[model samples]
Target chain A: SEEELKLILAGAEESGAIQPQEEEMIHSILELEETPVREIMTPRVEMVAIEDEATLEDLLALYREHRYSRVPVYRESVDHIVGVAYAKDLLDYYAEEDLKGRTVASITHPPYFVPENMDAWSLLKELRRRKVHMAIVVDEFGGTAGLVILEDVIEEIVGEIYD
Target chain B: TPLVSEEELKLILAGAEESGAIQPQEEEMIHSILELEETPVREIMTPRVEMVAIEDEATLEDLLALYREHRYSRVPVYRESVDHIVGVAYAKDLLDYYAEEDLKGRTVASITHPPYFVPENMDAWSLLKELRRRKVHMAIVVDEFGGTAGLVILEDVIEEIVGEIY
Candidate 1:
């Protein structure tokens, strides 16, 4: 209780003395000084996933359900990622009706990939030039590792680390 | 580690370009004057030895919990081998599952598709553009035997582009 009192007193003295945003900015900038890419890269096991056999209806459902624009299609596992499918393509292609057998493969465009150790700023430039939103993460074993989104890159730079 | 010669500090700070008094962060400045090393991805890949994984066998509650805990946007589905992938599951599946209250067994199996992969020796720049063109952020770095060497993220590609800014 005594320690808490002292700390609270100190905090009170500091409160409003520094602009909250400025303080946070400084903290983040200072944090960035030692920030590592690996620390922020989405962990490998928790990524959104998709497979090729999915019908257009399934793809649409995924898009509608997740509010995500794109998805990566893989073989039976992460190591066999084949392509990416766009939700817009499905909507655009089947707007007139519904899909029975049209798999996500029919609407999939090719996919792009990156290694596990990429940096933040350069990826931004690449994202801008390619006009892409997602990339597949790969490991040294040549297995499908994880995914990175344009939003992830931006979040590393101009966006807040935590809300 | 705490003490250094002024002359040495100057030399370290002058790295890359002496283009004025631009200061390097303390840790980076120290690393500048010393040889820095890193471990390879093979050293860090998570394998209880299996890359093959799936949530379909799990309850919707358990699967959705994995998404929140892992903070990933996507994950690979598999039966048992790292090679036998089924599909990628999305967070959106949670909502659908919530409405229906079931595992959606075929859902996991149906999502099986393809993924992007590259040789271990692939050049960094070309790979960056290729990733951009494909609008994807991660790639599988493969060995000569067509097995996974490690995974690479867009951030990995960026650092390669920045060319030793660290």
Candidate 2:
């Protein structure tokens, strides 16, 4: 079936019918179907994570330096991810009367888990279904292997996307 | 950005033009690269009708004539029909074959390297990447029905992105 689909797409492209951008997108679509999640996932060494015990002030500082909309929160170790922290949530608390005692654990949301070997197509579908942007890739031993985001999967089909 | 949407690139280029930061020629070159991003291999390929190829059974003298006529360092070789291209013969290989013996009675296929194949609809950017990765200079662009569409060269793809190189 995949072979047939490829032929159909190629045929349409060969007839001088399909536009160039459409053809490029179709090529990426096929490549995305075959690419494993591990190939696109950002390794742990490159991921930005905040400690669960970190104060709201710490979160703001890290956000200011990194300019990332989301940061994963870890407990005792970076591998033990507790949740993900959203910049919007921090802004929601900007007007609070008391912010000195607020911790990352207060504003962090649950982290989505996915296997490292999952294909990009399935991961994109899952991310869309859950309405989440990031997923933590776990190795066979259930340890954090890497991280994949909605942008990563989207990029596979549309090329690199920038904010 | 190294990679951006066509709309985004146009906007950035527009800003650069209005600010007078880039010359007209540089802007033109960048615009060509953006155009290349959306161009398929089929648009720039040497179509099958214009292909200067040799038959597998052709003699060395015949191959020489092809080279002199087409002025191409490499040429495709076919088995029976041009659509059934077997490989490509490099001019150097032919010269080596010439010095080793004589052009008395030598076939073209013997010195041919297996030709690489690519689909007709492949975008220029991805095809350019594949060309670099494989380290091959030319590929036989084939249609969906597995017939020869034409030939695409590394130079052709590169020229689309950066214009002609001296």
Candidate 3:
């Protein structure tokens, strides 16, 4: 054999060069870059997106059903996203004196877009930098590849779930 | 179709655990942080029903039995019930009268050090900091009317920080 990965692993384990948790913890060598968002993110078909023109009432029912902090909003087709809708923005409506024509567009934040090829760890900073909890992932051809959330990126490093 | 197959993937968990695996993720930090504030002393303190303490009337023989039974280095000496818990007794102090005859005259009351009380409603974090500054190992937690709610050791206060890291 050209040498052995098993021997190297044994040496690494016994020598304490790497710990299970402290050296970027969890199993698997700490890849300076982890896998791309394409692999971990929810696919376009799997995500629960709302119409760009949906009512706050409609958004309420969607949010209550999915239990997600943020939902991606689409324009007629999943490929073109108008923005992201924060679930907590509904509290403003709760404290409202009166409202008649308010829609999701009335309270949506601009969608933070990322490339599908963006690695999960790198995107963790981008998500924080943009001050948004979710992003719409775009593919090579500029169509929606999937969606990534802040929770997913955190789970990538901390654990199978970062819980 | 994938880099890892079901069988091939199985080795990762075992190999890692052999070295030490399963780190406390963000959930523990979030839990421990809130528990510091939200968790009260009553939840963390050892309630009187559970503590094996030396009663005021109990002789050194019974006290030695209690100490040897539980391997406790320090024991609370209470009067009547722990509701009136009064003194702190240490295992080292009883060595001067270890013989069968010497043990008869000594009561737990004479050997015990003074005790202090703290409020049950107080937050556990503040109490932990105060314990270090006061150089005390434990304190008696009392309720509004000052009945013993429980006994809290420094270790118990520290345990709450990593409580569910269990």
Candidate 4:
């Protein structure tokens, strides 16, 4: 049945009955069922994060450089990630005076963590269920593996890869 | 996208359905959303095969492991067939157990919140509002044949609508 569905979809695309974008989503959703979160998650070594003690100024610089809407905040090590800082939350404190005395730690909710083995569809559902924008992907020992942004998941679910 | 009333939704879908530019897949997408207003919860629910309810006889250790695995805020528990679910267990309450010395023998059923069941054909949008009004996370979706067919949550209800609009 699955193979037949794929073949029919391919046939539809051949006849202009479906757009190429729709064709991509059909294939993407199919592959995601078998794909583990580990395959798409950013590796810890490539993760961009800040220590809880870092000043808001430092956070601003990193956010500016990376342009990520969410960044993980670790207490001591990336493995000990404590919370996620949202770029939206930092909007109010752009001024140097507003940034004084507060660190990224002051403005974050507890980290929402997920296991590497979680299916992509399951993780996507949970993220939207919890209204979370980013999830801290954890290893078996609870150490950070990498992060999965909501946009990243969405793109993969209906997107193509480019170098 | 904000859910439009069925009246306006009909107009938009009619026009979009006629216009080849909207894409057939896109219409199928919106078709489901429009159908959501008329669709039975049964057609839109997580089927029993995909249902993740836990066993009623599980220990705190077993339940916690399930939580670690699924990461659901509240998970259903069943006596036999997952379709024969009895109650829901909250991750918060399951772990707040005191007296570790007295815990190993306790099954999660003792702490489970009562299950909320809805007829499989119940209006899914109304059920969505019902979930919000009651502040409940999930409702057990039951078929008329008497066995539980599946379960529905806020996201399961909204996903169809949101995905189509997106």
Against the native complex, each candidate's DockQ, computed on alpha carbons, is 0.03, 0.01, 0.01, 0.03
lDDT (Cα, 0-100) at B165 in candidate 4: 16
- Pairing residues by index, what is the TM-score of model 4? 0.49
lDDT of each: 0.51, 0.72, 0.63, 0.68
Candidate 3 vs candidate 4: which has greater TM-score? 4
User: What is candidate 3's CAPRI-style docking category based on DockQ?
Assistant: incorrect
Candidate 1 whole-model C-alpha lDDT, 0 to 1: 0.51
TM-score of chain B of each: 0.53, 0.86, 0.71, 0.71
Model 3 chain B — which ten-residue stretch has the worst lDDT?
B1-10
Tens digits of per-residue lDDT, candidate 3, A1-163, equal 1023233334444455333342233222234155788888898888888887888767766766676657888888888899988765554453132123577888788888899889865676566556677888998987998888865654454334211
Q: For model 3, which pairs clash?
A: none
What C-alpha RMSD separates each model from the true structure? 19.6, 22.7, 21.7, 16.0
What is the C-alpha lDDT profile of model 1 across B1-166, one tens digit per residue?
Answer: 1233434433434542243323233224223212211223333333324342454455544445565556454566555655544345555445433433364333554433356776666655445446656544556566678765655555554443222221
Candidate 3 lDDT over B1-166, as tens digits, reads 1233222323443444343442222224323433554567888888877887888787876777676668676788888877888788876455444445566577888888788688987777666655655545778888889788878876565445333211
Considering the two chains of model 4, state its CAPRI-style docking category. incorrect
Q: Model 4 segments beyond 4 Å from truth?
A: A1-4, A14-16, A160-163, B1-166
Docking class of 1: incorrect
TM-score per model over all chains:
0.40, 0.49, 0.45, 0.49
Q: Taking the tens digit of each residue's C-alpha lDDT, what string does model 1 give over A1-163?
A: 3233223323433553333432332234334434434456664576666788888777777766666666788879867888888664542332224466577788776787776666644454465567666777777788866777765644443243221
Order of models, best lDDT first: 2, 4, 3, 1
**Runs off by more than 4 Å, candidate 3:** A1-13, A16-19, A23-29, A95-100, B1-166
